[PDB]
Motif scaffolding. Structure first.
Motif, PDB file in Angstrom:
ATOM      1  N   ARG B 500       0.812  -1.214   0.000  1.00  0.00           N
ATOM      2  CA  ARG B 500       0.000   0.000   0.000  1.00  0.00           C
ATOM      3  C   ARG B 500       0.848   1.267   0.000  1.00  0.00           C
ATOM      4  O   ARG B 500       0.359   2.327  -0.405  1.00  0.00           O
ATOM      5  N   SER B 501       2.106   1.179   0.433  1.00  0.00           N
ATOM      6  CA  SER B 501       3.011   2.318   0.465  1.00  0.00           C
ATOM      7  C   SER B 501       3.936   2.370  -0.741  1.00  0.00           C
ATOM      8  O   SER B 501       4.828   3.222  -0.783  1.00  0.00           O
ATOM      9  N   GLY B 502       3.759   1.472  -1.706  1.00  0.00           N
ATOM     10  CA  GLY B 502       4.683   1.375  -2.815  1.00  0.00           C
ATOM     11  C   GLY B 502       5.953   0.624  -2.501  1.00  0.00           C
ATOM     12  O   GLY B 502       6.944   0.776  -3.221  1.00  0.00           O
ATOM     13  N   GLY B 503       5.958  -0.183  -1.442  1.00  0.00           N
ATOM     14  CA  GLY B 503       7.136  -0.936  -1.066  1.00  0.00           C
ATOM     15  C   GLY B 503       8.155  -0.167  -0.263  1.00  0.00           C
ATOM     16  O   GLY B 503       9.307  -0.599  -0.167  1.00  0.00           O
ATOM     17  N   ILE B 504       7.766   0.955   0.336  1.00  0.00           N
ATOM     18  CA  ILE B 504       8.698   1.824   1.040  1.00  0.00           C
ATOM     19  C   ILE B 504       8.604   1.654   2.552  1.00  0.00           C
ATOM     20  O   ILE B 504       9.629   1.591   3.231  1.00  0.00           O
ATOM     21  N   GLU B 505       7.391   1.587   3.095  1.00  0.00           N
ATOM     22  CA  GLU B 505       7.205   1.593   4.542  1.00  0.00           C
ATOM     23  C   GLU B 505       7.349   0.194   5.125  1.00  0.00           C
ATOM     24  O   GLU B 505       6.876  -0.789   4.549  1.00  0.00           O
ATOM     25  N   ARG B 506       8.001   0.111   6.279  1.00  0.00           N
ATOM     26  CA  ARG B 506       8.032  -1.166   6.973  1.00  0.00           C
ATOM     27  C   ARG B 506       6.689  -1.412   7.661  1.00  0.00           C
ATOM     28  O   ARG B 506       6.062  -0.471   8.155  1.00  0.00           O
ATOM     29  N   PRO B 507       6.232  -2.656   7.711  1.00  0.00           N
ATOM     30  CA  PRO B 507       4.937  -2.947   8.325  1.00  0.00           C
ATOM     31  C   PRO B 507       5.063  -3.087   9.836  1.00  0.00           C
ATOM     32  O   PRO B 507       6.153  -3.206  10.395  1.00  0.00           O
ATOM     33  N   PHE B 508       3.910  -3.039  10.498  1.00  0.00           N
ATOM     34  CA  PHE B 508       3.766  -3.586  11.840  1.00  0.00           C
ATOM     35  C   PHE B 508       2.478  -4.385  11.889  1.00  0.00           C
ATOM     36  O   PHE B 508       1.395  -3.837  11.654  1.00  0.00           O
ATOM     37  N   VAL B 509       2.595  -5.679  12.178  1.00  0.00           N
ATOM     38  CA  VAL B 509       1.442  -6.555  12.327  1.00  0.00           C
ATOM     39  C   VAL B 509       1.670  -7.427  13.553  1.00  0.00           C
ATOM     40  O   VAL B 509       2.684  -8.128  13.636  1.00  0.00           O
ATOM     41  N   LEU B 510       0.739  -7.377  14.504  1.00  0.00           N
ATOM     42  CA  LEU B 510       0.711  -8.315  15.617  1.00  0.00           C
ATOM     43  C   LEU B 510      -0.158  -9.510  15.248  1.00  0.00           C
ATOM     44  O   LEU B 510      -1.246  -9.349  14.688  1.00  0.00           O
ATOM     45  N   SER B 511       0.321 -10.708  15.571  1.00  0.00           N
ATOM     46  CA  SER B 511      -0.394 -11.939  15.265  1.00  0.00           C
ATOM     47  C   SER B 511      -0.436 -12.827  16.499  1.00  0.00           C
ATOM     48  O   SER B 511       0.515 -12.867  17.284  1.00  0.00           O
ATOM     49  N   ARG B 512      -1.542 -13.559  16.656  1.00  0.00           N
ATOM     50  CA  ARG B 512      -1.681 -14.461  17.795  1.00  0.00           C
ATOM     51  C   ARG B 512      -1.159 -15.855  17.480  1.00  0.00           C
ATOM     52  O   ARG B 512      -0.369 -16.411  18.247  1.00  0.00           O
ATOM     53  N   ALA B 513      -1.590 -16.429  16.362  1.00  0.00           N
ATOM     54  CA  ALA B 513      -1.054 -17.705  15.922  1.00  0.00           C
ATOM     55  C   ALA B 513       0.247 -17.475  15.163  1.00  0.00           C
ATOM     56  O   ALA B 513       0.469 -16.409  14.580  1.00  0.00           O
ATOM     57  N   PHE B 514       1.117 -18.481  15.187  1.00  0.00           N
ATOM     58  CA  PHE B 514       2.421 -18.349  14.552  1.00  0.00           C
ATOM     59  C   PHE B 514       3.023 -19.727  14.328  1.00  0.00           C
ATOM     60  O   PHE B 514       2.568 -20.731  14.882  1.00  0.00           O
ATOM     61  N   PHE B 515       4.062 -19.750  13.494  1.00  0.00           N
ATOM     62  CA  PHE B 515       4.822 -20.947  13.175  1.00  0.00           C
ATOM     63  C   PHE B 515       6.280 -20.534  13.009  1.00  0.00           C
ATOM     64  O   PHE B 515       6.624 -19.353  13.127  1.00  0.00           O
ATOM     65  N   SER B 516       7.146 -21.516  12.759  1.00  0.00           N
ATOM     66  CA  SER B 516       8.501 -21.225  12.314  1.00  0.00           C
ATOM     67  C   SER B 516       8.460 -20.278  11.122  1.00  0.00           C
ATOM     68  O   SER B 516       7.716 -20.500  10.164  1.00  0.00           O
ATOM     69  N   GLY B 517       9.244 -19.206  11.198  1.00  0.00           N
ATOM     70  CA  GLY B 517       9.264 -18.196  10.165  1.00  0.00           C
ATOM     71  C   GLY B 517       8.401 -16.985  10.442  1.00  0.00           C
ATOM     72  O   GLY B 517       8.529 -15.982   9.731  1.00  0.00           O
ATOM     73  N   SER B 518       7.527 -17.040  11.452  1.00  0.00           N
ATOM     74  CA  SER B 518       6.679 -15.890  11.753  1.00  0.00           C
ATOM     75  C   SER B 518       7.482 -14.659  12.146  1.00  0.00           C
ATOM     76  O   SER B 518       6.967 -13.541  12.039  1.00  0.00           O
ATOM     77  N   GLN B 519       8.731 -14.832  12.589  1.00  0.00           N
ATOM     78  CA  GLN B 519       9.541 -13.679  12.964  1.00  0.00           C
ATOM     79  C   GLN B 519       9.771 -12.737  11.791  1.00  0.00           C
ATOM     80  O   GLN B 519      10.064 -11.556  12.005  1.00  0.00           O
ATOM     81  N   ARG B 520       9.640 -13.228  10.558  1.00  0.00           N
ATOM     82  CA  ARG B 520       9.817 -12.378   9.389  1.00  0.00           C
ATOM     83  C   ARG B 520       8.707 -11.350   9.226  1.00  0.00           C
ATOM     84  O   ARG B 520       8.868 -10.413   8.436  1.00  0.00           O
ATOM     85  N   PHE B 521       7.593 -11.493   9.943  1.00  0.00           N
ATOM     86  CA  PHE B 521       6.385 -10.749   9.618  1.00  0.00           C
ATOM     87  C   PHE B 521       5.905  -9.816  10.718  1.00  0.00           C
ATOM     88  O   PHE B 521       4.932  -9.087  10.499  1.00  0.00           O
ATOM     89  N   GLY B 522       6.541  -9.811  11.886  1.00  0.00           N
ATOM     90  CA  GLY B 522       6.176  -8.836  12.894  1.00  0.00           C
ATOM     91  C   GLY B 522       6.299  -9.307  14.326  1.00  0.00           C
ATOM     92  O   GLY B 522       7.350  -9.799  14.742  1.00  0.00           O
ATOM     93  N   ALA B 523       5.231  -9.135  15.099  1.00  0.00           N
ATOM     94  CA  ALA B 523       5.227  -9.435  16.519  1.00  0.00           C
ATOM     95  C   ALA B 523       4.173 -10.484  16.840  1.00  0.00           C
ATOM     96  O   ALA B 523       3.236 -10.717  16.071  1.00  0.00           O
ATOM     97  N   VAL B 524       4.345 -11.119  18.002  1.00  0.00           N
ATOM     98  CA  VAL B 524       3.364 -12.028  18.574  1.00  0.00           C
ATOM     99  C   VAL B 524       3.195 -11.669  20.045  1.00  0.00           C
ATOM    100  O   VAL B 524       4.037 -10.998  20.645  1.00  0.00           O
ATOM    101  N   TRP B 525       2.087 -12.125  20.626  1.00  0.00           N
ATOM    102  CA  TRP B 525       1.893 -12.008  22.063  1.00  0.00           C
ATOM    103  C   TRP B 525       1.202 -13.266  22.573  1.00  0.00           C
ATOM    104  O   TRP B 525       0.661 -14.061  21.800  1.00  0.00           O
ATOM    105  N   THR B 526       1.238 -13.448  23.889  1.00  0.00           N
ATOM    106  CA  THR B 526       0.813 -14.700  24.500  1.00  0.00           C
ATOM    107  C   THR B 526      -0.696 -14.781  24.732  1.00  0.00           C
ATOM    108  O   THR B 526      -1.134 -15.538  25.606  1.00  0.00           O
ATOM    109  N   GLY B 527      -1.496 -14.039  23.970  1.00  0.00           N
ATOM    110  CA  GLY B 527      -2.934 -14.213  24.026  1.00  0.00           C
ATOM    111  C   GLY B 527      -3.558 -13.755  25.335  1.00  0.00           C
ATOM    112  O   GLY B 527      -3.097 -12.815  25.990  1.00  0.00           O
TER     113      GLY B 527
END
Ligand SMILES: O=[N+]([O-])c1cc(-n2ccnn2)ccc1NCCCCCCN[C@H]1C[C@](O)(CO)[C@@H](O)[C@H](O)[C@H]1O
Ligand SMILES: [Ca+2]
Ligand SMILES: [Ca+2]
Lengths: 87, 854
Positions: B500-527
């Protein structure tokens, strides 16, 4: 020929040459040596705000990019140009 | 928690079959005549001695001291699942050579040594050695089990009222590993359990199956929201890691036995695909794992600030009141969060037409305060012919389907809902494009996203999740893919914020479920934790176990999600959260408002003090996360990571380190008068960052505490950068000068780094627009140099102050900077505490410089 005096904090904790007043470093424990900068944690910045009520703001809100005074004088070197809104 | 709706291993038919196989003589054996040495791998046929089923073992030595073991059927009726999109690349291989052979054994050498793999034929077995030291054995207890695919509770199976048609029958796979010399194992999150994993012999195995467990309890091995199948083994002598690349339901057994720990993985489908990460140090394991699944995504600076959230803020006026409350009570805050009540009847990507009629103006007000907003977007889509999102996914066939070909329908927050097939790349592309400013109407560059319920949670589903026999892209069953469904949501959402930013802005996404590799995509919390002292305590071992497996952007709801914390508990939780990576207050719908200024003044002040400490440490946090992004090293660390030979630290979980510089022991008991802080390290010194008192290690120091105490110590030999001018948000601070805190070693030395960039774009990577500074002290000179010359940055940030702990009073202080005449700095010295403060160096942080103490 003549000479120039020094500045002393309002709480008497020190005395400094006047080139350390508003030199963007906190030298007085009460913050009195930096009334125009954001250097002191306990300092204050005075909005004159002609056309409205004058206001005191925290030193940490000087040049933080946020318009706090209606006259905009708290932002003079932050990239945020504040319009006068004292009306 | 109501335990009846979640299967124990006995109620899981494939777990019951596998776990009934007990240590003994394995019926599998390697057919050495079939042995082949391919370009990238060694292949050999395996046979079950009774059933005559033929399997194929693919054995690979890998670059960076890793071995990969894969086992599949020789000629299966249908292909078995192989986990995609988790590995960041095809792992570079190392050549295998036959260096020894007899009638029942073949010895293999990885490249030119020193690692060797001994393949035993009868019974089938694998041993891994460095020279002549046995590192690890595979199938030593003979627990390997590989249920082959037969002719289409072993088949049709019911749990409660839910029926698994199980069209492919039993297909589970399992394998055991022996770790000689290892007595401590860690990892396989997520579980509300201690950092050091417990033996499972007399109880349940640890379960890995992303599940939504209402009011979860502590100290039990029930599967929680995320699953990272990575186990770490630490001893005085070596570190090892096991990476079980399986996306299906997995149970893990742990047994101890000269000292030795045995690990057994049991999965429902897919192939056997395991990575052996040979160390020898734990940081070697970090590098090994990071090369496989990637590193922590570099968070935008704002997301490392304080997040203020709850279920729910009523309307735009409430959000703006919360915003003004922080400024009116002199408390910093970067993000305010909008839970599910901000949308139209839980139709995501929408806004309630009464309570949020002008989102752009709300976002513009926050932007004028230089603050951000997070809006929740869940992966369940309300079945509603008036809901455009539902109509598009329905019309394009992008929903998860049942066996009869219709779109799966479950129950969640909006009532009846369907679930997009996030394993489908066309669906992920659709999702990512939905976050464009034209599609997500009312969104703005300072709006970020929270992904919740992406296990997926299905209220009327078995164990509150999706049926095992739902069908995904390519015909794969839901049982094949379950544990990466959440990661795909996290991935598509994060990509959407980038596009949405044209590939310029870094994202921030919090996610509850995760797997190996989820570290590439943002943050998690313990629900959904609870406002209780024991839940406060358990945040440390839970995030630490996530740190060890690559998920550094971790946290727990400050104050507890359920119930109302007493003011003392809320204060202690703010102090705990202020020194954990992800820092967000959150609360259940029926809890009292607990914005930090609603408390009595004495509690407000301790909270404000904790917030100020967090914002001052942002340059330190930012640098730790850059190192996590570049090297794969966790930010929050167990003490045994920094002191691998101090066996008294192998189980510590009321204490943690940030990088190698700060040791934290937060108070986690009501009415406490002191804490017992273990300061490790021989010939090591630690500085109480509040009193500047020095302490020699190793010792257990009794430290008296008050309500405002946050026991933090700085290690001798480290330099910590701080922003001592706390402002209302991190955007306001990112051009401010730095204060350097030098903690002198007993040898009079110290070192540290500092990373800087614009704070939110990918320019540090696409244009090398960043700074990486090395600060070093030795003799009586502090030197600033470049730690990466490729990085340049236009910044007004300068060095306004240097605080040196453990130094005598000098006679003069001299600063030298390239391009400037030699300057004299005034200074202040406390003889009681041996603290030296250098006044206003005034040098740019982009310049090389040196300060000499005469
Ligand atoms: O009481 N039951 O078991 C129960 C049974 C049924 N049901 C329906 C059909 N059959 N059964 C339905 C409901 C419930 N209770 C509701 C549980 C509350 C726990 C919310 C979990 N919190 C999630 C979501 C947020 O709350 C809001 O997005 C976030 O705030 C939070 O962060 C995040 O974790
Ligand atoms: Ca001054
Ligand atoms: Ca301002």
């Amino acid at each position: 020929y003549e000479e120039s005096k020094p500045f002393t904090c309002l709480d008497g904790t020190a005395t400094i040459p006047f080139d350390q007043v508003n030199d963007d470093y906190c030298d007085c424990k009460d913050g009195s040596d930096e009334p125009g900068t954001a250097a002191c944690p306990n300092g204050s910045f005075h909005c004159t705000n002609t056309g409205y009520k004058p206001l005191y703001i925290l030193s940490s809100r000087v040049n933080d990019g946020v318009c706090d005074c209606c006259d905009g004088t708290d932002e003079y070197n932050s990239g945020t140009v504040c319009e006068n809104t004292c009306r | 928690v109501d335990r009846s709706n979640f299967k124990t291993c006995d109620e899981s038919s494939f777990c019951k079959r596998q776990r009934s196989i007990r240590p003994g003589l394995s019926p599998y054996r390697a057919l050495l005549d079939t042995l082949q040495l391919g370009p990238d791998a060694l292949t050999v046929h395996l046979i079950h001695e009774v059933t005559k089923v033929l399997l194929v073992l693919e054995l690979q030595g890998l670059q960076k001291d890793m071995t990969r073991i894969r086992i599949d059927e020789l000629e299966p009726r249908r292909p078995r699942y192989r986990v995609p999109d988790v590995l960041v690349a095809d792992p570079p291989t190392a050549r295998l050579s036959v260096s020894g052979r007899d009638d029942n054994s073949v010895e293999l050498t990885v490249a030119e040594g020193p690692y060797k793999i001994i393949l035993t034929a009868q019974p089938f077995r694998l041993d891994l050695l460095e020279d002549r030291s046995l590192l690890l054995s595979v199938n030593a207890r003979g627990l390997m089990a590989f249920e082959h695919q037969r002719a289409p509770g072993a088949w049709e199976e019911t749990f409660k009222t839910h029926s698994d048609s199980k069209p492919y029958g039993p297909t589970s796979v399992g394998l055991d590993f022996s770790l000689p010399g290892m007595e401590h194992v860690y990892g396989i999150p997520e579980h509300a359990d201690s950092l050091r994993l417990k033996v499972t012999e007399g109880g349940e195995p640890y379960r890995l199956y992303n599940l939504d467990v209402f009011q979860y309890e502590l100290n039990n091995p029930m599967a929680l929201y995320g699953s990272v199948p990575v186990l770490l083994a630490h001893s005085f002598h070596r570190d090892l890691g096991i990476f079980w690349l399986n996306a299906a339901e997995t149970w893990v057994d742990i047994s101890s036995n000269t000292p030795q720990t045995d690990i057994r993985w049991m999965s429902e489908s897919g192939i056997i695909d395991v990575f052996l990460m040979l160390g020898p140090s734990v940081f070697d394991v970090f590098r090994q794992y990071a090369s496989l699944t990637g590193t922590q995504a570099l968070p935008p600076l704002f997301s490392l600030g304080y997040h203020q959230s709850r279920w729910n803020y009523r309307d735009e006026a409430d959000v703006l009141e919360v915003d003004q409350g922080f400024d009116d009570h002199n408390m910093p805050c970067d993000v305010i969060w909008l839970d599910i009540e901000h949308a139209d009847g839980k139709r995501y990507f929408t806004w309630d037409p009464t309570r949020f009629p002008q989102p752009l103006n709300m976002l513009e007000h926050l932007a004028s305060k230089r603050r951000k907003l997070v809006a929740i977007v869940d992966p369940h889509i309300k079945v509603d012919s008036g809901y455009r999102v539902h109509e598009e996914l329905r019309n394009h066939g992008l929903y998860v389907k049942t066996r009869d070909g219709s779109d799966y329908e479950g129950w969640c927050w909006p009532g009846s809902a369907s679930y997009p097939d996030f394993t489908n790349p066309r669906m992920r592309a659709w999702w990512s494009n939905m976050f464009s400013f034209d599609n997500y109407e009312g969104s703005a560059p300072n709006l970020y996203v929270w992904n919740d319920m992406n296990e997926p949670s299905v209220f009327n589903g078995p164990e509150v999740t999706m049926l095992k026999d739902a069908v995904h892209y390519g015909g794969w069953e839901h049982r094949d893919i379950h544990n990466i469904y959440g990661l795909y949501v996290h991935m598509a959402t994060a990509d959407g914020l980038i596009q949405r930013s044209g590939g310029i802005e870094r994202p921030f996404v919090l996610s509850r479920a995760f797997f190996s590799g989820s570290q590439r995509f943002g943050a998690v919390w313990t629900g959904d934790n609870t406002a209780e002292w024991d839940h406060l305590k358990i945040s440390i071992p839970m995030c630490l176990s996530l740190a060890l497996v690559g998920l550094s952007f971790c946290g727990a709801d400050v104050g507890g999600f359920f119930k109302n914390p007493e003011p003392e508990l809320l204060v202690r939780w703010y102090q705990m959260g202020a020194y954990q990576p992800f820092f967000r207050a959150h609360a259940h719908l029926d809890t009292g408002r607990r914005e930090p200024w609603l408390l009595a003044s004495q509690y407000q002040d301790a909270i404000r003090d904790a917030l100020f400490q967090r914002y001052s440490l942002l340059p330190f946090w930012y640098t730790l996360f850059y190192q996590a992004h570049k090297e794969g090293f966790p930010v929050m660390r167990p003490l045994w990571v920094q002191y691998p030979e101090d066996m008294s630290t192998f189980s510590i979980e009321d204490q943690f380190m940030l990088g190698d510089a700060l040791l934290i022991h937060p108070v986690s008991d009501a009415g406490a008068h002191g804490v017992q802080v273990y300061l490790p390290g021989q010939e090591e010194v630690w500085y109480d960052i509040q009193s500047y008192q020095k302490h020699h290690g190793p010792q257990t120091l009794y430290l008296p505490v008050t309500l405002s105490s946050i026991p933090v110590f700085q290690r001798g030999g480290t330099i910590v950068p701080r922003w001592m001018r706390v402002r209302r948000s991190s955007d306001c601070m990112k051009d401010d000068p730095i204060t350097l805190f030098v903690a002198l070693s007993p040898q009079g030395t110290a070192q540290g780094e500092l990373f800087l960039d614009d704070g939110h774009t990918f320019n540090y990577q696409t244009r090398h627009e960043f700074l990486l500074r090395r600060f070093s002290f030795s003799g009586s000179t502090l030197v600033s140099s470049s730690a990466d010359p490729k990085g340049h940055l236009e910044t007004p940030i300068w060095i306004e102050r240097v605080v040196i702990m453990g130094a005598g009073k000098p006679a003069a202080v001299v600063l030298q900077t390239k391009g400037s005449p030699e300057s004299r700095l005034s200074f202040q010295h406390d003889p009681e505490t041996s603290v030296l403060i250098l006044r206003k160096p005034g040098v740019s942080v982009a310049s090389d410089w040196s300060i000499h103490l005469r």
